[PDB]
């Protein structure tokens, strides 16, 4: 959507394929001057870096610690988990000792 | 953020031209006839009527994108992993699962 | 694929601005920026050339020659009399290819000049240039202590790994004064020492190569008639003031000097709080000389986020 | 440019004579939107100007 | 008080005794370059001012 965030899309960084929609419509040429007027919408990009909100770093629950390489959250807790131990019994020790 | 295209345009001295397609994102093209374009060693050619001239526009990602860019994630089935450290008769380990 | 510097001359384009503050033709025309980096830094195109000789003279690169094109051909000049300023002066970084890396101060619209020895020629563009600075509070000039955390910028090396751009040859070059109707028919000039093509579409479509020959044709009047200075020897950046030849054909590439890296940049511990105590609560007494950024948000169910910016 | 003060300045070759008087300066543009710099391409209206 | 007015007293505009509380606490040496980094709070003069 033009003016909207994710105007331009690519599978990957340097992907030969692109596509968008920005709503380019072009001009007619102007008096006596070779040049070519031209009219397009302000990225998307800009536009919601400039109202992107709040990191969620700052806004999830349990005091999360977020990392982007795994996309993973650390040192987040809430709720119980039951486990089972199993131990040797050489561990153990005999009451008499 | 994107870096918009303005080639050179496709000027045809007294003749005629059309608007044809490509496969670039957001590509447009447009005519018109009739124009007299000027330049400092003078008029490169006029004629009032089969002059025209073409111009065309697509778009692309702007060079330092390659540090600017954000990804849209699609994101599911949140799995746990948790580290912890048991001790039993001064046995330690440390264990991740 | 290249990245040399002899193939490539530079071209004559349109300022929006002049030094007459009338739009018109200046061979210092230039279409875009980028200021991206977080030192405030910014790198500028241009039709011209500098960093190198003259595009076509003998040496390829001299740094102390600035490559433009004005009346027929290329010419030379000392690079040291170019200036730039959005509000005032801008001190140089680097400079390479068509490209100009530099720093200037806040501002509404940047522009460049430069004094031939007898002249002010000059181009200014509009853009929005502010100065924005990494981390949690906006601050002035970087302080000696802080702490040092990632940061983006240009750097200064001439070298470079990012970016692309397209090169090929140009369209023909039409000049007014090879034509003349002096004579009661055309009178041309290629003029002497030259290849010239000219053009009539009198009767229909009449072409003729003349070279150091003046010559004529049945349509008596000389306007409809065209004539090239062309010379097809030099590949070109595309430019939209600049008409595409019919061959519209990708011939070359070169490559963007001074592209974008990772680095460590320090930035200011502000004064730290005075932490009060308060029943189910906390009283807090924060202190600053510069609007700085502070948040905090539950441990628990209800995140409770909030964020707010702190002047004094 | 804009600003709030004007002044006139000349050197004798050995000091500097000028005088400074107040004035509000704006950079007042006719139309709708009130641009920065002339474009290359618009619209021909009515204008009023001072000739060289 | 840091921060308040009166932060800083004397019984003559001239008087070598002298007493204040503003809050001051050094900070640690930086990287590499001799100095003082310091910090303190804004004058309660300015700021009843
Ligand atoms: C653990 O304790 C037992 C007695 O309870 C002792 O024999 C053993 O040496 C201890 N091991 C270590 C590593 O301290
Ligand atoms: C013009 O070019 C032709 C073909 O290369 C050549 O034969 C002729 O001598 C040239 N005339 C000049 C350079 O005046």
Same mark, same amino acid.
């Given at each position: 959507?033009?003016?909207?965030?994710?105007?331009?899309?690519?599978?990957?960084?340097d992907?030969?394929?692109?596509?968008?929609?920005?709503?380019?419509?072009?001009?007619?040429?102007?008096?006596?001057?070779?040049?070519?007027?031209?009219?397009?919408?302000?990225?998307?990009?800009?536009?919601?870096?400039?109202?992107?909100?709040?990191?969620?770093?700052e806004?999830?629950?349990?005091?999360?610690?977020?990392?982007?390489?795994?996309?993973?959250?650390?040192?987040?807790?809430?709720?119980?988990?039951?486990?089972?131990?199993?131990?040797p019994?050489?561990?153990?020790?005999?009451?008499?000792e | 953020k994107?870096?918009?295209?303005?080639?050179?345009?496709?000027?045809?001295?007294?003749?005629?031209?059309?608007?044809?397609?490509?496969?670039?994102?957001?590509?447009?093209?447009?005519?018109?006839?009739?124009?007299?374009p000027?330049?400092?060693?003078?008029?490169?050619?006029?004629?009032?009527?089969?002059?025209?001239?073409?111009?065309?526009?697509?778009?692309?990602?702007?060079?330092?994108?390659?540090?600017?860019?954000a990804?849209?994630?699609?994101?599911?089935?949140?799995?746990?992993?948790?580290?912890?450290?048991?001790?039993?008769?001064?046995?330690?380990?440390?264990?991740?699962? | 694929?290249?990245?040399?510097?002899?193939?490539?001359?530079?071209?004559?384009?349109?300022?929006?601005?002049?030094?007459?503050?009338?739009?018109?033709?200046?061979?210092?025309?230039?279409?875009?920026?980028?200021?991206e980096?977080?030192?405030?830094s910014?790198?500028?195109?241009?039709?011209?050339?500098?960093?190198?000789?003259?595009?076509?003279?003998?040496?390829?690169?001299?740094?102390?020659?600035?490559?433009?094109?004005?009346?027929?051909?290329?010419?030379?000049?000392?690079?040291?009399?170019?200036?730039?300023?959005?509000?005032?002066?801008?001190?140089?970084?680097?400079?390479?290819?068509?490209?100009?890396?530099?720093? /200037?101060?806040? =501002? *509404?619209?940047? &522009?460049?000049?430069?004094?031939?020895?007898?002249?002010? @020629?000059? +181009? %200014?563009?509009? !853009?929005?240039?502010?100065?924005?600075?990494?981390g949690?509070?906006?601050?002035?000039?970087?302080?000696?202590?802080?702490?040092?955390?990632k940061?983006?910028?240009?750097?200064?090396?001439?070298?470079?790994?990012?970016?692309?751009?397209?090169?090929?040859?140009?369209?023909?070059?039409?000049?007014?004064?090879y034509?003349?109707?002096?004579?009661?028919?055309?009178?041309?000039?290629?003029?002497s020492?030259?290849?010239v093509?000219?053009? /009539?579409?009198? =009767? *229909?479509?009449? &072409?003729?190569?003349?070279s150091?020959?003046?010559?004529? @044709?049945? +349509? %008596?009047?000389? !306007?409809?008639?065209?004539?090239?200075?062309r010379?097809q020897?030099?590949?070109?950046?595309?430019?939209?003031?600049?008409?595409?030849?019919?061959?519209?054909?990708?011939?070359?590439?070169?490559?963007?000097?001074?592209?974008?890296?990772?680095?460590?940049?320090?930035?200011?511990?502000?004064?730290?709080?005075?932490?009060?105590?308060?029943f189910?609560?906390?009283?807090l007494?924060?202190?600053?000389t510069?609007?700085?950024?502070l948040?905090?948000?539950?441990?628990?169910?209800?995140?409770?986020?909030?964020?707010?910016?702190?002047?004094?």
């Amino acid at each position: 959507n033009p003016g909207a965030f994710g105007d331009i899309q690519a599978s990957s960084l340097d992907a030969t394929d692109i596509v968008a929609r920005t709503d380019i419509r072009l001009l007619k040429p102007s008096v006596k001057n070779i040049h070519v007027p031209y009219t397009q919408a302000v990225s998307g990009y800009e536009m919601w870096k400039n109202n992107s909100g709040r990191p969620l770093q700052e806004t999830a629950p349990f005091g999360c610690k977020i990392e982007v390489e795994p996309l993973r959250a650390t040192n987040c807790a809430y709720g119980h988990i039951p486990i089972s131990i199993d131990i040797p019994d050489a561990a153990f020790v005999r009451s008499s000792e | 953020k994107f870096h918009t295209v303005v080639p050179s345009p496709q000027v045809k001295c007294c003749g005629s031209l059309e608007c044809k397609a490509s496969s670039k994102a957001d590509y447009t093209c447009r005519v018109f006839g009739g124009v007299y374009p000027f330049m400092w060693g003078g008029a490169q050619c006029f004629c009032d009527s089969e002059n025209t001239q073409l111009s065309e526009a697509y778009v692309e990602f702007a060079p330092d994108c390659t540090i600017d860019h954000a990804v849209a994630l699609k994101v599911h089935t949140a799995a746990l992993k948790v580290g912890l450290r048991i001790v039993y008769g001064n046995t330690t380990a440390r264990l991740d699962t | 694929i290249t990245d040399d510097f002899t193939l490539t001359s530079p071209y004559l384009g349109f300022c929006p601005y002049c030094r007459h503050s009338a739009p018109c033709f200046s061979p210092i025309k230039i279409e875009n920026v980028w200021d991206e980096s977080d030192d405030g830094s910014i790198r500028i195109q241009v039709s011209a050339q500098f960093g190198y000789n003259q595009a076509g003279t003998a040496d390829v690169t001299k740094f102390r020659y600035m490559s433009y094109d004005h009346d027929h051909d290329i010419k030379e000049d000392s690079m040291e009399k170019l200036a730039i300023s959005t509000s005032g002066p801008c001190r140089r970084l680097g400079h390479k290819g068509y490209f100009l890396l530099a720093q /200037c101060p806040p =501002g *509404d619209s940047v &522009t460049v000049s430069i004094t031939s020895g007898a002249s002010e @020629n000059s +181009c %200014t563009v509009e !853009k929005k240039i502010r100065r924005k600075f990494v981390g949690r509070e906006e601050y002035l000039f970087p302080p000696v202590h802080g702490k040092l955390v990632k940061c983006h910028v240009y750097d200064h090396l001439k070298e470079t790994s990012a970016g692309y751009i397209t090169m090929h040859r140009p369209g023909p070059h039409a000049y007014k004064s090879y034509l003349e109707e002096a004579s009661g028919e055309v009178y041309i000039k290629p003029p002497s020492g030259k290849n010239v093509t000219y053009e /009539c579409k009198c =009767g *229909d479509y009449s &072409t003729g190569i003349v070279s150091t020959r003046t010559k004529m @044709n049945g +349509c %008596t009047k000389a !306007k409809q008639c065209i004539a090239y200075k062309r010379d097809q020897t030099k590949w070109v950046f595309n430019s939209p003031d600049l008409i595409r030849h019919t061959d519209h054909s990708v011939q070359g590439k070169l490559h963007i000097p001074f592209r974008l890296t990772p680095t460590v940049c320090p930035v200011p511990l502000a004064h730290t709080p005075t932490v009060t105590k308060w029943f189910k609560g906390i009283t807090l007494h924060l202190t600053a000389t510069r609007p700085t950024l502070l948040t905090t948000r539950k441990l628990g169910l209800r995140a409770d986020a909030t964020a707010e910016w702190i002047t004094g």
